[PDB]
């Protein structure tokens, strides 16, 4: 919640996620 921006938005389920993750947090999609 602090200087952690960079979240990526999905393109299949339409859901944002943290850049520290490996996949989506809604559809479980493989991060690019
Ligand atoms: Zn997704």
From Swiss-Prot:
It is found in: Nucleus; Nucleus membrane; Nucleus, Nuclear pore complex. It comes from the Eukaryota. Zn(2+) 2 binds at residues 10, 13, 24, 27. Phosphorylated in interphase, hyperphosphorylated during mitosis. May play a role in the reversible disassembly of the nuclear pore complex during mitosis. Proteolytically degraded after poliovirus (PV) infection; degradation is partial and NCP- and TPR-binding domains withstand degradation. A zinc finger (RanBP2-type) spans 4-32. Belongs to the NUP153 family. Contains FG repeats. FG repeats are interaction sites for karyopherins (importins, exportins) and form probably an affinity gradient, guiding the transport proteins unidirectionally with their cargo through the NPC. FG repeat regions are highly flexible and lack ordered secondary structure. The overall conservation of FG repeats regarding exact sequence, spacing, and repeat unit length is limited. (Microbial infection) FG repeats mediates interaction with HIV-1 capsid protein p24 (CA). Part of the nuclear pore complex (NPC). Interacts with TPR (via coiled coil region); the interaction is direct and provides a link between the core structure and the TPR-containing nuclear basket of the nuclear pore complex (NPC). Interacts with HIKESHI. Interacts with SENP2. Interacts with XPO5. Interacts with RAN; the interaction occurs in a GTP- and GDP-independent manner. Interacts with MCM3AP isoform GANP; this interaction is required for GANP localization at the nuclear pore complex. Interacts with MAPK1. It is linked to The variant p.Pro485Leu has been identified in a patient with spermatogenic failure. This patient also carried a homozygous loss-of-function variant affecting a splice site in the NUP210L gene, thought to be the cause of the disease. As NUP210L knockout male mice are fertile, it has been proposed that the increased phenotypic severity associated with NUP210L loss in the patient was due to the presence of the additional NUP153 variant. However, interspecies divergence in the nuclear pore function of NUP210L in round spermatids cannot be ruled out. Component of the nuclear pore complex (NPC), a complex required for the trafficking across the nuclear envelope. Functions as a scaffolding element in the nuclear phase of the NPC essential for normal nucleocytoplasmic transport of proteins and mRNAs. Involved in the quality control and retention of unspliced mRNAs in the nucleus; in association with TPR, regulates the nuclear export of unspliced mRNA species bearing constitutive transport element (CTE) in a NXF1- and KHDRBS1-independent manner. Mediates TPR anchoring to the nuclear membrane at NPC. This is Nuclear pore complex protein Nup153. The chain holds residues 722 to 750 of 1475 of the full protein.
